[PDB]
Ligand binder design. Structure first.
Ligand SMILES: Nc1ncnc2c1ncn2[C@@H]1O[C@H](COP(=O)(O)OP(=O)(O)O)[C@@H](O)[C@H]1O
Ligand SMILES: [Mg+2]
Lengths: 371, 55, 77, 55
């Protein structure tokens, strides 16, 4: 039979059968209970709208993501999300399909063990396998080397790989991602008068960020230009009218990636953690990693980031090496495409964690040889 | 619109591939010509050594 | 110990052709076909239908004027 | 329209420029490589005649 390539993510759940080009169903991972009282009788009001249904009734819900930073903080809601994904968005019972979840690097063990225990006890799948979210993104590019920066919505991690041999001592995981950029944008919009507070209006700020923000090639020059002319002010229409005008908030929101001091984080930007991740590698594979830097994940879709990052790394790196940044147009679904490719391989067909194996060793089987 | 963006993306993929190939070929030419000229210098030094041996 | 992947045979970077070159031409041609058929179905039919509705609207206007005038003529007392 | 034409023409020009530059570089690379081979072949015989002279 065919395998189910699910990809929990944090912000958008992407799923679909193995062997295709794009995920079949992509929908936000939010579960929102209603918060008001409700007076109409017999309206058929449910107790929790999940997935894309709660992005249409969000006016009277309190949306809450079940995955904070890669890790899962609310297991009941995550179980509800998985149940919805299997039964309503794909309509395939899990009793007859292997599953291939994905997990960020350096995550707590208990999260992974609970994930496999749920998949084997509640949904009762035949066999499931957990894979690191960066190796898949490297599969999708058709490479076999390269250092991949997978800046998702929950957590940004940077896994270097050479000739198929991952370097476990050079993984640099940073917890700045799309959600913190949304919060920072929502916080700097208040400098013009627009106040978004409700958890429903966070979605509106996210839409503003997606449609308007861009990464500046040079930050100081843009700050000077936006403060003199008015060629940058782009307007946007809220879900009820009252258009708003975003000035130099456009390139200040995604600039947080390269200067995490804006949101008070100490660490260095995504332009310098990649160079540090490279320098921890051996001295003989640094040229190949320099030449095959891969971008993935949703948050790396800002217009103009593949040039800013290349300029920064070229500034840091030695002058002789060639710096090349692979930015495929299908960046958002790169991890899932790689997952489909991996699940479609014949050599991989014996790596699944078969159910009888789980019955013999318990949920701690995932840390064992079947990784 | 829709198809126009995809066509632009194709025209850009061609751009990147052609430019990268051009740069790589230029680097190859630089390396090969440096090799040849160093070999020629070695040949010259051998001629001079032969001259000293003849003397 | 870290997992040990059993040794296989092949391949990689050879499916990039079979997943890229396909849509490099088929997708462009199919989207061009879709745009052509949608424009043909939509624009000319919409303009013709709007002209037809405009003519019907003018006829309704004439009927309204005639009825209003005759009723005002009779009722004027 | 206007933007599509100019952008498409400029990008095709970029592709053609890169391609022709790469071809010129590769031609010079091949010529330099063959000349280098000639230099090697002559240098070996120069060494042989030098060795005979020294003997
Ligand atoms: N076109 C876009 N431009 C800018 N940011 C985007 C765009 N699309 C998605 N994002 C950001 O990326 C996030 C989605 O990232 P995603 O790759 O789905 O995360 P995950 O790894 O959990 O799947 C969204 O929250 C949004 O903030
Ligand atoms: Mg991801």
């Amino acid at each position: 039979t065919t395998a189910l390539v699910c990809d929990n993510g944090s912000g958008l759940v992407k799923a679909g059968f193995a062997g295709d080009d794009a995920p079949r169903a992509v929908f936000p991972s939010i579960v929102g209970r209603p918060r008001h009282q409700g007076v109409m009788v017999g309206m058929g009001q449910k107790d929790s709208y999940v997935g894309d249904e709660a992005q249409s009734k969000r006016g009277i819900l309190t949306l809450k993501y079940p995955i904070e930073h890669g890790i899962i903080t609310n297991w009941d809601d995550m179980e509800k999300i998985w149940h919805h994904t299997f039964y309503n968005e794909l309509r395939v019972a899990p009793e007859e399909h292997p599953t291939l979840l994905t997990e960020a690097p350096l995550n707590p063990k208990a999260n992974r063990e609970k994930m496999t225990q749920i998949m084997f006890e509640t949904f009762n799948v035949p066999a499931m396998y957990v894979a690191i979210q960066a190796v898949l993104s490297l599969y999708a590019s058709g490479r076999t080397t390269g250092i991949v920066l997978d800046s998702g919505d929950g957590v940004t991690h940077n896994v270097p790989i050479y000739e198929g041999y991952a370097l476990p001592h050079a993984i640099m995981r940073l917890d700045l991602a799309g959600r913190d950029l949304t919060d920072y944008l929502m916080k700097i919009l208040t400098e013009r008068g627009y106040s978004f507070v409700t958890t429903a209006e966070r979605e509106i700020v996210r839409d503003i960020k997606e449609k308007l923000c861009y990464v500046a090639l040079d930050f100081e020059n843009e700050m000077a230009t936006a403060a003199s002319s008015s060629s940058l002010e782009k307007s946007y229409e809220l879900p009820d009218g009252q258009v708003i005008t975003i000035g130099n908030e456009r390139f200040r929101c995604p600039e947080t990636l390269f200067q995490p001091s804006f949101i008070g984080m100490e660490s260095a930007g995504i332009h310098e953690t990649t160079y540090n991740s490279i320098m921890k590698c051996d001295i003989d594979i640094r040229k190949d990693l320099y030449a095959n830097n891969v971008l993935s994940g949703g948050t790396t879709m800002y217009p103009g980031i593949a040039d800013r990052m290349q300029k920064e790394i070229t500034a840091l790196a030695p002058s002789t090496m060639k710096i090349k940044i692979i930015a495929p147009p299908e960046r958002k679904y790169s991890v899932w495409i790689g997952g489909s490719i991996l699940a479609s391989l014949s050599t991989f067909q014996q790596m699944w964690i078969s159910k009888q194996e789980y019955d013999e060793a318990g949920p701690s089987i995932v840390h064992r040889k079947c990784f | 619109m829709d198809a126009i963006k995809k066509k632009m993306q194709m025209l850009k993929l061609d751009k990147e591939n052609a430019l990268d190939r051009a740069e790589q070929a230029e680097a190859d030419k630089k390396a090969a010509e440096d090799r040849s000229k160093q070999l020629e210098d070695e040949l010259v030094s051998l001629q001079k050594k032969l001259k000293g041996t003849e003397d | 110990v870290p997992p040990k992947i059993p040794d296989g045979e092949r391949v990689d970077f050879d499916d990039i052709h079979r997943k890229r070159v396909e849509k490099d031409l088929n997708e462009l041609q199919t989207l061009i076909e879709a745009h052509f058929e949608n424009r043909k179905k939509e624009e000319e039919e919409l303009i013709s239908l709007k002209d037809r509705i405009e003519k019907r609207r003018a006829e309704r206007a004439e009927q309204q004027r005639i009825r209003n005038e005759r009723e005002k003529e009779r009722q004027n007392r």
